[PDB]
Amino acid sequence: VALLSGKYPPDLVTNVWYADAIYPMYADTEVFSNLQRDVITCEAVQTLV
């Protein structure tokens, strides 16, 4: 059903749509804090061994 039935907004532009949609989720810090977390994860196993 999802393959056979799909439509667009009636007059859309596919750069305005994305410059509006992708914008608010690029003020997060979890994508950096996981990089902080992987340091502790990698150093703890070296301290253990």
Binding site: D11, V13, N15, V16, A19, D20, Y23
Partner: protein, 49 residues
């Protein structure tokens, strides 16, 4: 804004005058649309002062 733009010509090194963020188009602008053409017009006439 017009008289402050004229007064800013004297104090070039201390203060600089720019057009606001909100006077630009939404995101990009899409020449397809009509309102952003007039936005471009207003901006391109305001900028040389």
């Amino acid at each position: 804004s017009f008289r402050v733009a004229l007064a800013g010509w004297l104090y070039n090194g201390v203060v600089t005058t720019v057009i606001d963020d909100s006077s630009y188009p939404k995101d990009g602008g899409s020449v397809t649309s009509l309102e952003n053409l007039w936005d471009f017009f207003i901006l391109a006439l305001a900028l040389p002062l």
